[PDB]
Ligand binder design. Structure first.
Ligand SMILES: O=C(N[C@H](Cc1c[nH]c2ccccc12)C(=O)Nc1ccncc1)c1ccc(N2CCN(c3ccc(F)cc3F)CC2)cc1F
Ligand SMILES: O=C(N[C@H](Cc1c[nH]c2ccccc12)C(=O)Nc1ccncc1)c1ccc(N2CCN(c3ccc(F)cc3F)CC2)cc1F
Ligand SMILES: O=C(N[C@H](Cc1c[nH]c2ccccc12)C(=O)Nc1ccncc1)c1ccc(N2CCN(c3ccc(F)cc3F)CC2)cc1F
Ligand code: HEM
Ligand code: HEM
Ligand code: HEM
Lengths: 446, 446, 446
């Protein structure tokens, strides 16, 4: 085998994470240029990280099975929050079955009544918060509130929402996030030591599990028709003929809510931010034309089948600013990538950021252009690819499209600074800088 | 409960400590503004830190007992230097009794002969080091030398000083400080691992303990009158009727000397730095008027009761540049703070820096103005507040005021750069940048 | 004892390593100036580091035996790569004997046929890569390739090179380097925890050991004349009458190749970079005069005895940019350094960088001047000094001088930017910034 070339080891401890939090794109482009190779290795905290930064080789990265490019070792930071024996922390066979059970709950087939539930919360929100003829809001925080409120209406039954509302859900997820050390992907030794915040999060999730249990007992003693997410997952049956444990169900619900909270929020925000920008009026007008073709009450078919332009807007906002900068796996057995082999124990990564800004794939990559197409097949990896592709993608897109169509139909927006906000690359999920997201809404003439 | 809002988690490991060491004020003001709340939470190394940045809520932070906002877990870094079973490392009841025994040794009631002892060392120092009609000194280092020399004359008997002089004391404290990892407040897992520097410091303190023991044996075999600090503490009796161990006494002496070495030094320096600045001549003239009302030999009453203006100068230098930027505690049981609850396991903090620069409390907070008053009651927290307030405050103020009155009576000073020195926020105790503290003394016409 | 003075402890974890990776010279000069002492102590991660930054006191640092200023504890990071019981990881007596056995293999006495072997590889390389009349290359990478290719021809027999060629060797060393955490010199607690990359490197070296074993078995079953490095080391006999183990031999070969890969490469590059710079034409002309005094085929005597000017060029490039910025040891028993004592447990360091830029020793230290002499005796410490001085120095100098003489005889070079490249201080071995090393070769008129 030929090893990819290697950026030589630097002295500050985890110093490359600082660069990755400040200018990740430029850092990776430098690595690529200096070593004259799209496939290259860096060393972070003693751990080799090999980045497939050539769009043409995406298939090598996304094809292999979890047994061989495993996500388990790279997501050890998440075990306290989701639970032992849940998702990435489960043996491979159970892992695959659990993920699939969640994927089954979020198929287009399961979305009956979701668009009206979403429209209802959004309208409730706009009437509570956007009351005036005119007013100033933080668009990032309000999208975030709408994402959690709308997800909770779609996924959880009324009895569940009565005991556990979106605000409590939001707090719990936010507390959990605050307990993580994202750098510890490169500090596996740390995660073997006792961490107090870890015990705290497990009690928090155990409290959630208690609520969930009480709900099931109450539903079981009043029935004659549990087709919400909780209900669906409790009815799943593994290949061996057993059921998921409530522990496992609770964990998968947390993971689903945790996954969508920032990614979908960010995507909504960027999309709305580009569309209200004056130099994009042409695309806004185009969006209104599409929306006005439709009544007030939307449905699944309108949003998902009959809004191709709104789709290009959302996709191109994920293209330009992907909220997850890296997809990563642990190499469990060595793998070929072009003329190279990437050895076992390496972390192998593919970067939606680096790849969405490749000039060959996306000519003039700093331009937000909803009409563009990829020049390289598979270079859009906003939701990953292959067999492990985002299983929440259709649910996320339904939410974002519905919120977009409801909001722009009822309100005009103006960004209260000249340029679109800069991404803030310091956070785990990357989105627009919070203090640059002030916007003025104006209620449209009824 | 409602959780305070949370700055979302950042990727560089302990990256917020870098900002806290470079621009802490601006970092915290940003957190406050971006989240629209004076009470807010950040995550450092996986550990939630909730900052009470509203001056009006100081009472919630400073009221609770050590059983419930505990200092023990946040000061684990200090256990090697002070000893197991000493101070913050003692069970709560013993902790309280030990701290109180030290507080009792440093009451105004115990200061007979301190002002003359201080004046004597300062005069000895000025005659050894400031010999000429005119000359250049580093004011920060010389204040530091005067603080340790004067503390040793007040607190330790001649026999003790003969075996352990201020220079040796200074070295030992300085060696101990060099062994600490202040960031490990956010790395409790680290402090459970063996650290070699920790064993070294304990041998150093054990050597100190040996000297102290020999002194006691020598005093016990020559007496007919141990009213120094060592003597006082050895005579303390716990509620159960036993005595502190020599181990515990030794530890409390170290902690007392360690506490005052930089804080008091820094406060002296800032005070002298502002007063010699030309735009402050008006306050200098005012200070001389007050000093000239008094003979050469001062006494307790002059310094502590009859120098109200010198007091405003020292207080306002602590206001403008508090040497401890944060008071912190571990939440052992949850607590209310305004409309929020701060959960167990959080670190809860209140910042004298952030609070002394609040515009409502201290209008035009960058101005050093000794005549100002707080506009918010309890917003001055230079020495903390409540039941856990600095127990060295009266001793520190006596030293600083005495040094100020002795030095300015005998010398004029001029700062050898245009602007007052910038604080250097990189160190544990924060003071003026060392290389900006060059000053020229001029011996006054006798 | 008097302790050296101490820069007071800073809050960011390992924050001084960031400064050391960005501007080490300025950082250390600041420490020296601010504390008014050439001998001074900083605290990194809780570990005191005392730097002998006075050229006049070099002898204190370099005299003491390994039992008392030990390299073992500071080079724990290297144990996985070289092996347990090898070099710095061996008990002191074995350590001394092993190092000596390697030193014996690299004495001038052992270099018969090295200059022709080197000239042969360099010429092979130039003909493969520098084929045209004219062309653009990265001088740093090509010197690196020449250093490893030429070392392998000198040190390893044909049978060994047939199974393990320079490219495979280069990869293996590069993989090993990528597994290190240089900051962990200041994190001894980390190196006591399991690190996965450590197990990987040991398997890699075990694979190398297997190849080496097979070679020995094959040589042992075909002989009638193992005078390469492998052969030499296998014939070494300890004081007790036993032989090195193949494990130990394998480890010492790795350490030798690892030591020379960047240091010698960097030194070649800098030397060539200065000599092709136009303002240095005067020294280039001088170098050609010396080279032209000699045939095409060089020999040991020409290179090592008859090239005094080429020697000054190489030495002065190591003077101006020493590839190892610090020589460090663990104080095992306390030691005097001027008016100070440096206690046990301190890391004591001497910096070739700081010392080669001292204005007293090297007037106008930013000027590359091959005719200069030190103004302070022992201030050149590019290869260390004393009893522990670099044991590869004569081999490194032979390689560098031979490559210099062969290349400049056959080619002209031009740097494709105006100024000599900046050093990149981020890496373990420090050399010229990689992307500033583009050069244009021109084949000379035959
Ligand atoms: O937000 C993250 N993850 C969280 C938690 C999570 C993890 N895996 C999941 C699988 C399913 C559901 C949730 C999760 C998350 O919400 N991820 C997510 C995944 C899929 N779909 C939506 C959201 C996350 C985000 C960033 C991150 N980093 C920071 C960048 N990094 C990195 C990588 C390479 C470098 F050179 C430098 C770097 F700094 C280490 C990985 C690590 C992370 F875990
Ligand atoms: O100088 C410090 N402490 C030392 C040692 C010490 C500790 N507790 C004591 C109680 C009694 C006597 C001595 C001590 C000290 O001398 N403190 C002191 C306390 C009271 N009166 C005078 C002096 C010190 C100083 C700073 C520090 N940091 C750095 C800032 N930090 C922090 C906190 C929040 C953030 F967002 C970011 C930050 F970086 C962690 C706390 C931690 C510390 F321990
Ligand atoms: O390149 C390094 N070493 C490697 C591996 C190695 C170690 N010891 C050996 C002995 C014999 C052979 C190989 C080795 C190496 O190739 N060193 C080498 C030594 C002698 N002759 C040639 C090369 C190396 C290079 C730098 C380094 N640092 C970074 C700077 N540092 C440091 C020190 C003081 C500070 F204030 C701040 C700092 F960041 C910690 C030491 C540590 C290292 F181990
Ligand atoms: C805009 C929103 C989202 C973005 C941009 C996003 C992005 C991604 C990406 C990049 C992957 C990696 C896929 C691969 O390995 O090739 C992924 C996987 C995943 N996403 Fe999302 N995601 C989003 C929303 C969601 C939501 C709402 C859920 C809720 C269930 C979710 C759950 C997952 C899961 C479970 C996986 C792992 C699939 C596996 O390992 O097989 N994501 N997502
Ligand atoms: C200018 C000098 C000093 C400053 C600015 C200062 C500042 C502080 C502050 C802010 C606190 C926290 C009090 C609270 O929890 O509300 C404190 C506590 C303390 N200080 Fe100081 N301090 C100084 C000098 C000293 C000295 C000379 C000693 C010597 C004994 C000392 C010993 C203590 C102790 C023991 C506590 C803890 C009290 C407790 O937990 O109950 N300090 N100081
Ligand atoms: C330009 C190339 C090199 C430079 C600048 C360099 C620099 C140094 C320095 C500064 C030392 C520390 C000596 C002391 O403690 O006083 C040293 C030691 C050493 N070098 Fe090198 N070195 C180079 C090449 C090599 C090579 C090619 C080898 C191959 C064997 C090597 C092996 C060693 C060893 C084994 C030591 C440790 C000697 C001991 O601890 O007794 N070095 N080198």
């Amino acid at each position: 085998g030929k090893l990819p070339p290697v950026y030589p080891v630097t002295v500050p401890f985890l110093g490359h994470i600082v660069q990755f939090g400040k200018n990740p794109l430029e850092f990776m482009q430098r690595c690529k240029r200096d070593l004259k190779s799209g496939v290259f290795t860096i060393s972070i905290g003693g751990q080799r990280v090999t980045i497939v930064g050539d769009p043409h080789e995406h298939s090598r990265f996304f094809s292999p099975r979890n047994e061989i490019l495993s996500p388990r070792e790279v997501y050890t930071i998440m075990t306290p929050v989701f639970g032992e024996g849940v998702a990435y922390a489960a043996p491979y066979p159970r892992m695959r079955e659990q993920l699939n059970f969640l994927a089954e709950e979020l198929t287009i087939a399961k979305f009956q009544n979701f668009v009206p539930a979403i429209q209802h919360e959004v309208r409730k929100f706009m009437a509570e918060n956007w009351k005036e003829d005119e007013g100033v809001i933080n668009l990032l925080e309000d999208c975030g509130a709408m994402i959690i409120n709308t997800a909770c209406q779609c996924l959880f039954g009324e009895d569940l929402r009565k005991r556990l509302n979106a605000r409590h859900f939001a707090q719990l997820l936010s507390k959990m996030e605050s307990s993580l050390i994202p750098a510890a992907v490169f500090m596996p030794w740390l995660l073997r030591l006792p961490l107090p915040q870890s015990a705290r999060c497990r009690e928090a999730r155990a409290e959630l599990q208690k609520i969930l249990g009480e709900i099931i007992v109450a539903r079981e003693k009043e029935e004659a028709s549990t087709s919400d997410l909780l209900g669906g997952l409790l009815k799943a049956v593994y290949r061996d003929g057993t059921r998921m444990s409530l522990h496992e169900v609770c964990g998968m619900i947390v993971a689903a809510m945790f996954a969508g909270q920032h990614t979908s929020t960010i995507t909504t925000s960027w999309s709305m931010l580009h569309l209200m920008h004056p130099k994009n009026k042409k695309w806004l007008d185009k969006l209104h034309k599409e929306i006005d073709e439709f009544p007030a009450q939307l449905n699944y078919d309108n949003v998902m089948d009959e809004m191709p332009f709104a789709e290009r807007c959302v996709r191109e906002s994920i293209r330009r600013d992907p909220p997850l900068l890296m997809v990563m796996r642990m190499v469990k057995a060595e793998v070929k990538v072009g003329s190279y082999v990437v050895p076992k124990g390496d972390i192998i990564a593919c970067s939606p950021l680096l790849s969405h800004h490749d000039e060959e794939a996306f000519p003039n990559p700093r331009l937000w252009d909803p009409e563009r197409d990829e020049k390289v097949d598979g270079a859009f990896i906003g939701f990953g690819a292959g067999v492990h592709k985002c299983i929440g993608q259709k649910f996320a897109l339904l939410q974002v499209k519905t919120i977009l169509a409801t909001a722009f139909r009822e309100y005009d927006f103006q960004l209260l600074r000249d340029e679109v906000p800069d991404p803030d690359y310091h956070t785990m999920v990357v989105g627009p800088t919070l203090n640059q997201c002030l916007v003025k809404y104006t209620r449209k003439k009824k």
